[PDB]
Amino acid sequence: GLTEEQRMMIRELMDAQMKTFDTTFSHFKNFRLPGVSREEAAKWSQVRKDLCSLKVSLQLRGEDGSVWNYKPPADSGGKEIFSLLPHMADMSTYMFKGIISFAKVISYFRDLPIEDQISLLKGAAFELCQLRFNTVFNAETGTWECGRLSYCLEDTAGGFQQLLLEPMLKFHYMLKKLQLHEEEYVLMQAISLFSPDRPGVLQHRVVDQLQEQFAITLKSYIECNRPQPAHRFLFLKIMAMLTELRSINAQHTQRLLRIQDIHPFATPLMQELFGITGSSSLTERHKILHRLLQEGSP
């Protein structure tokens, strides 16, 4: 079995997940949709590469049974490559709010100093979003099922194997294949959130201790509820996936900064999370995050 401390830890994480993960996307409303001079050529050509890896069609199912399908344009060499950005910023911002709420209900996170709470969320927001998204990913259809909204991968000229080149996509297939429990996903979220080596973290030693205990709890969970030799290296596979997810986080941050630079699209919350200015302490540069963290949890 697990210790009482370990059981309590899992209960609190699952509680937090239950209160703050809108798994059917019922409250995601009022989002935007695609509508009805030399060294910049190098930036644009790089941003062209940064976007045309992640191409999705968008499906909107109506209450009444009707379906709207959006197929995105071919790259004719212009603004059209940006057409999904407002929508993606709205969806990202929505997911980030849920992750902030997640962190806030966890006792161990609230007890950290506010600047560390900010630093950890800046560090982990993308990672936790991707972990939540994996739970709605259908590997058979290549589709993220977000209630009435779905995002379907548009196949490129190589096929299924050529899409697996793109690290974010490979990650979602690999993680989905492990067939994790709800409890194992939420422990993954905790391990990522409580990363002691994120930029700006002051209480490194406390965060390290916390991370270690979440990891130990995951390892024990696996030993007790999948005790057969088949799952002997599952914990280590999960940790390797967290390491890969961290690499992907870094690449994605850089892409976002490049796109933002030539076509502004980040919402104010996204600007704070990713280090963009629109105008001295961590608290004054992150006023929205700070407000969201000090507000009481519904």
Swiss-Prot record:
Coiled coil: none annotated. Expressed in liver, colon and small intestine. It comes from the Eukaryota. GO terms for cellular component: chromatin; intermediate filament cytoskeleton; nuclear body; nucleoplasm; nucleus; transcription regulator complex. Its main location: nucleus. It is found in: Nucleus. GO terms for biological process: cell differentiation; cellular response to molecule of bacterial origin; intestinal epithelial structure maintenance; intracellular receptor signaling pathway; negative regulation of DNA-templated transcription; negative regulation of transcription by RNA polymerase II; positive regulation of DNA-templated transcription; positive regulation of gene expression. Residues 5-278 form the NR LBD domain. Heterodimer with RXR. Interacts with NCOA1. Interacts (via domain NR LBD) with CRY1 and CRY2 in a ligand-dependent manner. Nuclear receptor that binds and is activated by variety of endogenous and xenobiotic compounds. Transcription factor that activates the transcription of multiple genes involved in the metabolism and secretion of potentially harmful xenobiotics, drugs and endogenous compounds. Activated by the antibiotic rifampicin and various plant metabolites, such as hyperforin, guggulipid, colupulone, and isoflavones. Response to specific ligands is species-specific. Activated by naturally occurring steroids, such as pregnenolone and progesterone. Belongs to the nuclear hormone receptor family. NR1 subfamily. This is Nuclear receptor subfamily 1 group I member 2. It comes from Homo sapiens. The lineage of its organism: Eukaryota, Metazoa, Chordata, Craniata, Vertebrata.
